[PDB]
């Protein structure tokens, strides 16, 4: 309680080393959204952390 999961709106294939790939519906906890467009996140599927394009997720 007191936190929000995010969900992927679309599939995404990561292209750069620090980025996560994911499929539509995958759930995330956001770790840092303060440094621009690309948010640091943890996939709740894999447990991996990396950047995701913020326009590809929305709050649950």
């Amino acid at each position: 309680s007191g936190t929000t999961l995010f969900v992927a709106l679309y599939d995404y294939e990561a292209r750069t080393e620090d980025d996560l790939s994911f499929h539509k519906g995958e759930k995330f906890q956001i770790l840092n959204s303060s440094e621009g467009d690309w948010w640091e996140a943890r996939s709740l599927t894999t447990g991996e952390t990396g950047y995701i394009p913020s326009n590809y997720v929305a709050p649950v």
Binding site: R15, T16, E17, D18, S21, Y51
Partner: peptide
């Protein structure tokens, strides 16, 4: 992978 560098200014 992914293999490409992440640009530091992104």
């Amino acid at each position: 992978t992914p293999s490409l560098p992440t640009p530091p200014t992104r």
